[PDB]
UniProtKB/Swiss-Prot annotation:
Coiled coil: none annotated. The record marks G33, P34 as: Contributes to redox potential value. Changing E70A: Strongly reduced interaction with CASP3. It comes from Homo sapiens. It is found in: Nucleus; Cytoplasm; Secreted. The active site is at C32 (nucleophile), C35 (nucleophile). Its main location: nucleus. Pfam families: Thioredoxin. CDD domains: TRX_family. In case of infection, ubiquitinated by S.typhimurium protein slrP, leading to its degradation. Induction: Up-regulated by ionizing radiation. InterPro entries: Thioredoxin, Thioredoxin-like_sf, Thioredoxin_CS, Thioredoxin_domain. Keywords: Acetylation, Activator, Allergen, Cytoplasm, Disulfide bond, Electron transport, Nucleus, Redox-active center, S-nitrosylation, Secreted, Transcription, Transcription regulation, Transport, Ubl conjugation. The gene is TXN. This is Thioredoxin.
């Protein structure tokens, strides 16, 4: 499952609740073709990697998180461990998404 993040507080709470687990965040827009293409895949990874936490931020519905995270393209994937950012890249690149998970987990 992909947890939808609706507020700054909810993000932070998710990062805290994660403990030591890798957290992967998909920053997405409805108007972004590539994001929509990669959503089923992101969701599939959330089932495959049961000890990784998967979050989705819609950049327009959750614009204050988008601003603070310094998003400019979609999709952007950010990776956190113990509250700290440990990776980030952009683009709907499945291979790279799954590889980065394996590198950071």
């Amino acid at each position: 499952m992909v947890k939808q993040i609706e507020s700054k507080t909810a993000f932070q709470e998710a990062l805290d609740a994660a403990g030591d687990k890798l957290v992967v965040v998909d920053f997405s827009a409805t108007w972004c073709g590539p994001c929509k293409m990669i959503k089923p895949f992101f969701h599939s990874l959330s089932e495959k990697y049961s000890n990784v936490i998967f979050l989705e931020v819609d950049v327009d519905d959750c614009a204050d998180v988008a601003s603070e995270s310094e998003v400019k393209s979609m999709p952007t994937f950010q990776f956190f461990k113990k509250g700290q950012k440990v990776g980030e890249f952009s683009g709907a690149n499945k291979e790279k998404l799954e590889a980065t998970i394996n590198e950071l987990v």
